[model samples]
Structure formats: structure tokens, C-alpha cells
Target: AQYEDGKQYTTLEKPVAGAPQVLEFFSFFCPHCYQFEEVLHISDNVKKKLPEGVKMTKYHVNFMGGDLGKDLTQAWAVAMALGVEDKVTVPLFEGVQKTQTIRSASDIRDVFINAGIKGEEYDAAWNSFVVKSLVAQQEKAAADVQLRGVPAMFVNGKYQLNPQGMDTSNMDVFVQQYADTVKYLSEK
Candidate 1:
């Protein structure tokens, strides 16, 4: 249960609220992030181990996917606005990382459409002021964290996990250690 500062995690320059919170900054185009979610199901597994009242929030980073990054971020906002994020997240990730079909905003639209959200509903959410603000907030958050990579995690808005510093020789051990670290941070 030993964790060291500057190795397992470093303090954020501008820490957010001190309340227990776990926020993940990731991109749909990141292969590791895709594996984290789809292949390993790290998010789901970690959620099961989290304490009560501590929730994990995912932020779509706008630094990857080339020009499509912003579009994907906006698409994620739209999904949040429409309450279909859980429904479309996997498909969107699969399309971008696996199928290589989500190349444009229109491709994202198709994914939402396939998720049973009507075209107009998607447009309304995509163009709504609230969704726009959410996207702006996400972009600002990325900037605030000085984000330089995908699948970056922050606990209690201050401690940023250093995945590279973790013991990753085994997947089971990695997941267990990861969740254990997060749970410890939440109670901090």
C-alpha cells in the first residue's frame, strides 16, 4: 500500500475542489484508452470498487484525432446532452479505433442515429447552448490540467495518477493496483 509522491502521482498546479472525485481525461482515438475501456473495462471495474458518493467522470480530450478531435468532443457533449453517452460511447470508440469508420462529424452523427437518437435530436443537442458550454468546459479542463496524453486520471481533482509509474507487468495486478490507488486517494 506504499505510494510515493511525484511517482505514482503528482499534484496539479491548479487543483479543483478537494472533494472526492475521479476524473479521466481521454480521447476516442487513443488506442490505449480504447483498450482501457473496451478491452480491459478498467472504468467499470474501478467503479465497482469506489466508495459511496465518489463518482468517476470521463472527459473527452480535444487534442487527438487531428481535426476531428474537436468534432468528437462536441459529439460527446451532444451524447451527454441527449443522455445517450453510455449507449454510444462503445460504438463511437469502436468506430474510431477499431472499424475506422468514424472519420468525420457525419460519421459520429451516424453512430448517434444508430443508437436510436433521431437526426434532429442529435442536431438539437449538438447545437444547444448547454452542450456548447460543456464542450468549452472540457476544452478548458484539458488546458487546466496541461494535458499531454490520453487516459490521464486525476483523483480528488488534485492527484494525477502516473500510469507509467505503476507496475504494469500483469493486467490483473495492474487493474487491482490502479483501483486500489484510486480508492486510497478518494479517502484522502
Candidate 2:
């Protein structure tokens, strides 16, 4: 299979060790990202396709430049800080994109509360220095990639996963398409 290396994907500026890294640049507020989840079985299938030791990171984008964007980005950073992203990520995505119950920063607390986190603990992380710093850095990182759009992906810091010129089809095809490219990169 043709790996759309530099054409579809970009090389990582700062590569990590041990194994390849797959960075998914996304926003919970992005409608396309939300659609990706519904149509792709996203997180699960990607994890299943990953080779052992491959690392994956989701970079949340706040470049939309709204109070809601800033707040929800922090919410995601806090969940990651608290080591609860696995618990809250999808629900956070669904809450905003699906249920619309989580409309603002305060509403995010309830998602955590239902996920078995104490309200006070959520409040502390939401207000803490660590979470704040992570959000700050991510704000810059979002700009670093100069990311064109959400659900944009980078593999091994080197391939921008866009099927743009590839003549790929459908959400399922587009989603799984990256796996082959990634496997090819690994072999190289």
C-alpha cells in the first residue's frame, strides 16, 4: 500500500523514543470529531490496531478562540491531569456534541461526578497549577502544528493523516486508512 508519508502526513519535529507516536489533534467541540466518534468506533478500534509499544496522545485544540473553547479545553486537560480521560473523554465528547448537557465549564463537573470522581476533587484539579500549565502548553502546541482542522492526525511526528489527495472513501475507510500508513512507517 502507498503510505502517503510527507504528502498526507508531516514528520514530527520532536520525535519520541521506544516506539512510534500517533498524535490526534482534535477538539471535543469539533462537529467532525464528534461525527468521527459516531461513525468510526474511534478510540477502541485504533487502540486495537496499534502495534505493541506504540504511543498515542490526543492533543485538544482551543484555537477556536471562544470562552467555551477555552473552558472545555481546560476541562479535558484537567481530566487528563486527574488520570480520568479514559473515563471522561468520550462522555465529554458526547456531552457536548451529543447530549448538549455539558454546555460550559461548570457543567463539566457533573460529567466527572457521574464518572465517580468527587466534586471537590474535580474543582481542585480544575483550579490547580499543574492543570493550568498543561492547558497553557497545549495552547501553544496547538499553534505549533498550525493545525488546519480538528481530527487532524500526526504519525511518528512525521505524516499528517489527511486522505485529501489519496482518493480514499467513507468515514470507516478514512479512519482505518491511517492504520496501514502507520504500520508501513513502523516497518520502515
Candidate 3:
């Protein structure tokens, strides 16, 4: 998918109800996404430093397609539904980037269990209406936004890829710029 001007990304449309939202589009399989993990950590720290009403959400891009995409889609949906997304998301990212062996849903469940997420809780969330709804919403958002790649971000309703346009390098700079962008829009 490619970016289309004036279209809403999936993550942005699923705002935190009353909270100010920051939505990130990323992929576990992409090395750039791994590199940007630190940026997300920085963003998390910044969010913590801020007052209430600030929230961040992540959407995994199924750029590879096929079963891998399906697994990621399901895993993200389950995480969101369980209300443990912040807890499970980073661990899942590590499982994919570091371990590089566990790709199946069962393996993902085992990883979650190892991370202390109760088995029944994980199971129920995986099959819950919320998860299914979120997945459907994600698919719709992907189509509407015409996502082209991973590691893209949408601050409020605007896209913030790099410092300038969508082709800037210097990730550290880009991350800082994005953080600033988030701060700027979040205040509006």
C-alpha cells in the first residue's frame, strides 16, 4: 500500500476515546523498525513525562503478506483486546527480532505466557470481540491509508515520516523531530 493524502491511518482512527493519541505504524520483521524501537522508547519516556490524557498505540504492518502477516495481525489484535498492549508489545517485538524462531501463533502465546500473561486471559482475548473488531478496523485503515511501508507514524491525523517530507535520514534527528511533532500536535 502507498500513502494517500487526506486518508486516516488505522492507528489514528482508533483513538483512546478521550485521550490524546499518538499512533505508530511499524513492522516487527523490518530492521528499521528494530532501530526505531529506541525512538519509541524515547517517545514512551516523553509520554510519561507529560501529564494525563496522552496515549500511544501501535499498528503492525503486514508488508510481507501471507501467514506471517496474519500472525502479526492476530497478535496485535489480541494484545489490544487484552488491554496489555504496552506490556506484551515490546516483548513480542523482542521475540521477533531477537529470537527469530517463534513465528507461529502458538509460539507467540507461549512467549506471552513466559512473559507472565495468564494463559486463559491470553486465550480469551485472542478470540474476543474486541480483538476481532480491532483487526477488522486495522484492515480497513490499511486500505484507506494505503500504507506503503513500516515504521511510519501519524501524529493526530497528519503523517510524520522524517524531519522533512518522507525521505530524510538521520533517524535520531527524525525521532526527535517526530517527538516534537507529537508534542506540538498533542497540545492542539
Candidate 4:
């Protein structure tokens, strides 16, 4: 595969960080993002296949669900703050995408509450400076890359992966190709 600019990947307007990182931009409310995780199981699969020291940072976007989208982004930050993303990501997806139960940020908090997080802790994380900073950073990253879609992947904060550039007919091949592309770009 060529993995060339405007094809496999494209250079960002301004680089944000150094190499050896896979930065993911996704939305909790996005059905495609939900499918990327639950159906395809690409996120963690790709992570497990990645070479050592190559890290993945998932940033929840605020563009998909409008006001609720922004709130969900904050909810993601809160989950991160409480260290329960592994427990809440699926439920968050189900609540927003499948179950149609999550209407507000409070509903998001309830998901965490059900995940064994304390309500006071949730409130503390929600009101924390670091979580607020995380949300702001997420918004900045989405804009920095001029993000137009969810489930987007970038390597070294510069090269944005274009899935159409690689073979995607088969699910396994697609995940392998994506992981390979991420590895290739992270080295660049």
C-alpha cells in the first residue's frame, strides 16, 4: 500500500505532538463510532495489535449530537477522570445510540454511577479543572484537524488516516490494514 498523502493519510495544518501515537477522534452519539467499537471491535483490537510504546488516545467529539454532543464529551472526560472508561464506554454507546435512553449529561453521569462510581466522585470529576481541560483539548483537536467525521484516526498528531485508501471489504483485513497503517504512519 502506498499510504500516500491525500490517500492513506493527510498531513495536518499544524502538528500537535510527536510521533508514536494514534489519536482517535470519535463521538459517543455517532452510530458509526458505536459500530466501530461494538460491531467491528476495532478500537481495542487495533490497540492490542499495535507495537510496543505506540499509544492510542481517544477523544470524544462534540459535533455529532449538538448540545447533547458537547455534554457527552464532558461525560467522556468525567469517565476518564474517574478511571472507568472501560466500564462505561459500551453503556454510553448503548444509551446514546441503541437504547435511546441518554438524554442529558445527568443520564451520562448515571451510567457511571451504575458502573460503581460514586455520585460525589462523579460530581468532583465533573467540576475538576483537569477534566475541563481535557474537554477543551478535545474540542481543539477536532478543530485542529478540521474533523468532518467520527471514528477518525491520526498518527503522530499529523497524518490523518483515510480508510478508503486501503482495502476494506473484509473486516479482519480492514482492522489489520488500519493497524498496519497506524504503525507505518507513527514511524514517519
* lDDT values, one for every candidate: 0.84, 0.72, 0.64, 0.82
Model 1 ranges off by over 4 Å: 18-20
lDDT digits (tens) for residues 2-82 of candidate 4: 667887777887876643378888898777788788877877777877776766788898778889988988988888777
Off by over 4 Å in 3: 1-21, 38-42, 45-51, 163-174, 185-188
Model 1 lDDT tens row, 58-175: 8898778688998999998887777787899899999998889988899999999998999888898888999999898788777777789988888877898877888877988888
Higher-scoring candidate on lDDT, 2 or 3: 2
lDDT of 3 by residue, 98-153 (tens): 87766788988887798788999989888888888888877666555567876666
**Alpha-carbon TM-score of each model against the true structure:** 0.93, 0.82, 0.73, 0.91
lDDT of 4: 0.82
Clash count in backbone of candidate 3:
1
TM-score of 4: 0.91
Q: Which is better, 1 or 3, measured by TM-score?
A: 1
**Of the pair 3 and 4, which is ahead by TM-score?**
4
What overall lDDT, based on C-alpha atoms, would model 3 receive against the true structure?
A: 0.64
Lowest lDDT 10-residue stretch of candidate 4: 13-22
Which residue pairs show collisions in model 1?
none
Model 2 residue runs over 4 Å out of place are 5-20, 165-171
Candidate 2 residue lDDT tens string, 1-188? 35544554556566534322666777888887876666665655666777768777776887663788788888888888988878887788888878888776778788899999998899998899999898976676656666668877666654566546444456667667656655566555
